[model samples]
Target chain A: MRVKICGITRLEDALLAEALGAFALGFVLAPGSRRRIAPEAARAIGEALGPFVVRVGVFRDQPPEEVLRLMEEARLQVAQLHGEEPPEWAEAVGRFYPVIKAFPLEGPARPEWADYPAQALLLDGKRPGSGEAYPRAWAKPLLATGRRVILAGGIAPENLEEVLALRPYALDLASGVEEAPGVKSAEKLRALFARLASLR
Target chain B: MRVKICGITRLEDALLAEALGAFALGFVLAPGSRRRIAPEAARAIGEALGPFVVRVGVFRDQPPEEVLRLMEEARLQVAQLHGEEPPEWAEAVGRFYPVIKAFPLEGPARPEWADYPAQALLLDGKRPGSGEAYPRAWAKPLLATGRRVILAGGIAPENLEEVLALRPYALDLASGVEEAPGVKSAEKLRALFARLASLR
Candidate 1:
């Protein structure tokens, strides 16, 4: 069960997640999100962690050139697209770095999903990052769609078992392990990892 | 020349703003926006402000019940709907509170916008609060639609003179008078008020 601890705002959370064997750590670069991080802050964390760790930058419908510029400046390993951007932008970005295209489950199937050359797909609830979950049965089929599907939204230690039953390529989480919007809860992190370790 | 100072995160910014004769102070309650304020923090600010000055809660696509609950809990005077919610939601919210319905100036006129029951409409750029401006000519027609128009997006001391020429009913601003996101710049605030004071 691969897991990505998303919304890492503090350096401690990033280090703690890496020490706990998290697959990736996400830093939101979007303008208005509470979890949004400064490029310099993200760069500092990325440099401290070195090249072995996967650092994902989260953005929402940013211009293609701006995204690339930010990725270069911040040293992010992957870019997670969280808005309804054109397939061409994703295609262009995919050439340079791994791209995770997030699709809200309640919305219609975007035609781009069939042919877009993104590295992975993240399925989230209607309100992205709202901690609301889509019905398990509704999300089950997408797991076998030949794309790397990362199940997201409302993922916590309590319900990880239900989502793990489907065997998604990974699970992306944010507020689930948060003490506040950008603050991670130490107790929650320890408990969450212990549960995941049980799956092995 | 009424003005709204959006993205007030600190109490000093809120107090200094009200003391300087600003019209309203906005606290973002949206799940993802960088300027998002915790309900408890917003409530405290609202309580301290003592109800004379308007407190607006900025939100994206949130459920109706959740919106009302937060509004009441945070003691906000108005709800600013900034997402593509069905018109009925705005109507429902308007019945209980004054609603500021925001529309992108670059998009085609929302057919439902003409009849939306909100007290006022805010016209913003393609990327709301991104400090980008839509063509001023395109937004002039909205004033004739009979909705009270609050001009927003890319409003700063640098271009306030140009936007002011249009005589919008009010102006909503963020990032323009900020030292950083959520931090107000005193010098910029003084400059902003001087312009508004001159217009009156």
Candidate 2:
């Protein structure tokens, strides 16, 4: 039942996520993304969080060197690659931190994704930050491989249980818990946590 | 000036205070107090804050051994004594962590308070946490004694500058930045930081 609240832009939102039992806080470091956070700001937020919770940086198509630099500067513990980065690219940063390869689904989960050199595999929508739900049927094949699957995109309290039934290793959520692109709604976060209390 | 946000009960508020540039976060370990936090809760909140932001435990009339125990359990770096403890009591805890002795003013500043065996002295209203303003004029004598003075009680954004002009070593706030007893208000916190933008 590990949960990651992604697309963090404000200190307040990061703190709220930590308070509500989020296992990790995601900072979008992808250069062109609308919800991206500056490395300095991300570092400050990471420094404020508890030592135990994981800090993840989301990047897309950046050079491995660039990803390594940003990951160090931001004090992030995990590097989540959201682009079509090759295994070599993931391997380069993986030497420094745990890597999560996010696959944006245009169709069903790819069997090749399970073989990617990453600590975890994330199944996302066609658009990573888009609130649209991806097909749940896609998670079946990935989970069948016994790989660590982090299910993402359009996950809210409504469909959380259904997704959990598939038994992904973790859940990564962004827009589902947000008020806007980077602002998290407390009401939404509280509702999700309350529902998770029994499960957690 | 350094700032300590007292009466912290939630990880969100503690993280918010640190993010907004607070130098320290205080948790009330005093028994029977309205805003009192359990040592376990205090430890969790303290663990969430960045390592550099000081964690302070507020105790009133608790035995010196009891204070030390709670401070250790809560992982606090400072002990703030708010009761009529003697210099010996302050000395006992000061050996382990920095101490701040909070003096509730019933009249003008006592010259002898400056001699208390603690790293700092806090000049507070007649009733601490009552949100009542103490006479600003009382801070002069204590500050003149060349001791570290932390001014508290009834400090809001409106009068923050006025108090800062006195040049106390730091400012301590609780109700001014809170939505209720232990919940912080984002609007109020932002307004206070906005006013402090130039000064900080």
Candidate 3:
């Protein structure tokens, strides 16, 4: 499965995460997130990143056109919507970039969410970006739908094997491997990759 | 006077420093420093910085040729020597770019240090880069010299007025304005610049 590391705030952390097996790197563009990075800073990191790695912008309740503008300016390849945006908003942004509509597993999945036009559905904790663990049971039903699903929240080296057992399309990690909100811990990242190597 | 914020490891901090009236930005390129950044990473930050701001690479005990090489590759405008290198070493780097020779205020000034071919002399704390306050008395004599002097170490908003009173050509700050070693605090930076604004 692929690995997505979100809340990237610096080039060092982004490069380290990419080197340590991150398939996708997320830059939080939303103002509410403490880990939010400026577009210019994100663009600099994206420019220095390896070509094979995907650069994603995480937004919340932003205008569709503005999101597309930022994604283009920052050279991001994907958009992960983490707010109560309508399906049409996602579809609008999908015209220029792939969209990953995020849905908190706080309650039952909305029936209309199936038609969001997003390339994938990211199942996150109840309070998105909180890093708190959510009920694994909420994710099972979504995984059962056969659509691509990326599991996030409270994933660390100790629980990696168990989370992998759920077998979602990919795993999204943020606080699990950080030194602080935006600074990543090199030791934790190396340990995580080492754990993954042994499992495979 | 001018300000050179050292230990820059991120683009966001670099840009923020520049916007807040910083005349120069220093990237720790030496292996011995915790704030050391990759050449590629420093290059990206330099490229993203404003044209007027000087991009500096800080070295310690490294070969003069290697220092020249790293400065060229990273597109740095100046080289700050922070180790015990001969005057010829500083002259060797000066052929390619201007150099700032750093000296710790642990004791009396070495006679040879005055003869080093450098643009400025940076007087730092007893343990350079340790963020510990050095004896202000040690710096008074250096300031008496007509040579350009840059003050550094344990400098913050609280001590900005006193430090500036010494009449150094510029100021070099690191840990005092940081949230951690390599991560800068926006609030602290704003406050520092605000304090500087009030003084002059």
Candidate 4:
């Protein structure tokens, strides 16, 4: 199972999550959240890591120009957008780096977004950053999109078995594994990873 | 009524949105959407605008470290997290900047998110950026929190009166005003704004 440990604020958390078998580390580039870190700090954490682990820069409704500038400055390998960005933005960004398109699963998926060209796609709860789950029925139609759908929102260790049964390309955790904002509880991380191991 | 014209791409669009009385502008930095713009583009757009308009960055599940870094680089005034970032992360980012916590109206509000200190809270439809309508019953409890609540998701010219009846501090729109992604239909933008004016 591909595991993405999101909301990393410190290098230690990044290192720890990576050591625990996380496939990717997400950095929040958008402002105003407690977990929001500077690009320099993100670069430090990202540069410290060994290759193989993916470095993702998270953004919201920021412009495509700003996304590219920040991606280069922070040296992020991937860009994850949470708002209504167009397909052309992905193609433009992909010209230089990988892109992870994120859609909040509150309503039915639009036909236009089904064909979005990106390295991966994340299906999150309608409220991004809120630890809530989407309706189970929401995932059914997205299954046929022929894209690697990363499942997120309201995921916990106890629910892994059920979530994995759906066969998502990756499972993303933010609040579920965190002790607090920017601080992760090792015990919770272990519980999650241990459960993931069982699935493997 | 604070108006946020989201999915802005060009500097002209930013200026136009502001000129059209937008209190804030949304620039999509996220990947794989028609509205996504790069950081450099965001900077240019932001720079061209007057000081009255706040520039907000939206993100999914990115690292907090990166969020802080880019906030500075992009000079974003506010950050809206749309994914599963926990309260701790919100609190941490709130320490330095204003954070907007968005709740998708897919399910009941999670009890834990109630106490997180945020400048504002938005209750949107489950399909964010998709222009899906929100149920009024789902939003009734959220109003009790006393945070500045912004109503988003599927708000349009026709429904402004119904939305205004909810007495939201502001309203956010993406697809509601779009002719297509990245292209704001001028007529729709004018109509939406005109309806917003009637709220006062």
The per-residue C-alpha lDDT of model 1 at residue A155 equals 86
Ten contiguous residues with the weakest lDDT in model 2 chain B? B45-54
Better of 1 and 2 by DockQ: 2
Summarize candidate 2's per-residue lDDT along B1-200 as a digit string, tens digits. Answer: 55778899888888778667676788999998878999999987654444335677899998889998998788665789999898898898866556789998887888888898877889999887888897788888888998878889889888887898997777888889888987899889888877875664
Per-residue error (Å), model 2, residue A160: 1.0
Tens digits of lDDT, candidate 2, A1-200: 66889999999899888767676788999988978999999987765554335678999999899999998677665789999999999988866566889888878787877899887889999987888897798888888897778889899977888888887777888888888988899899988887776554
Stretches of model 2 off by over 4 angstroms after superposition: B1-200
- Tens digits of per-residue lDDT for model 3, B1-200: 56788899999999888778676788899997989999889887765543335678999999898998898677675789999878899988866456789998887555455566787788888798789987666777767766667889798888887778887778889988999998999998999888886786
Question: Candidates ranked by TM-score, best first?
Answer: 2, 3, 4, 1
Q: What is candidate 2's local distance difference test score?
A: 0.81
What is candidate 4's lDDT per residue for B23-55, written digit by digit as tens?
Answer: 678766666656778877786666555333457
Docking class of 1: incorrect
| Regions of candidate 1 where Cα sits further than 4 Å from its true position | A107-112, B1-200
The true-structure Cα RMSD of candidate 4 reads 22.9
Best by TM-score: 2
lDDT of 1 at A3: 74
Which candidate ranks first by lDDT, i.e. highest? 2
Instruction: List RMSD in Å for every model shown.
Output: 22.5, 14.5, 18.0, 22.9
List, residue by residue over A114-153, the lDDT tens digit for candidate 4: 5887666788988888778866557657766755677898
